[PDB]
Design a protein around this nucleic acid. Sequence first.
DNA 1: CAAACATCAAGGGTCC
DNA 2: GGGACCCTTGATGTTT
Length: 82
Amino acid sequence: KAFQKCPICEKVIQGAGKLPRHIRTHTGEKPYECNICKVRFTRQDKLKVHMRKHTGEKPYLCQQCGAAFAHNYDLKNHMRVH
DNA sequence: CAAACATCAAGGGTCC
DNA sequence: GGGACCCTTGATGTTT
Ligand SMILES: [Zn+2]
Ligand SMILES: [Zn+2]
Ligand SMILES: [Zn+2]
């Protein structure tokens, strides 16, 4: 696909609009905010996964028995138990 | 005092 | 560019 060069550390970052999330590791900037617990995050998806704590959600449902888990690895461990 | 094991967050990839 | 989920590595912690 496409690649970018980091202006700060000469790192090569793959992704069209993915450079700013890499820059935020250097600037230490967390533009996103949890409306409930007010904790701030550098990436929107990291806020979304945090929101699964408040809005109790288990998207990783088991394809075998239907049980659902909040984290993908808890599903993996349950699947390996079968 | 270590390994072993576990959980979970941080960076980057990859598709859509 | 923006969402979103996956994968790898590492910090931190508990149990040997
Ligand atoms: Zn950089
Ligand atoms: Zn919150
Ligand atoms: Zn199951």
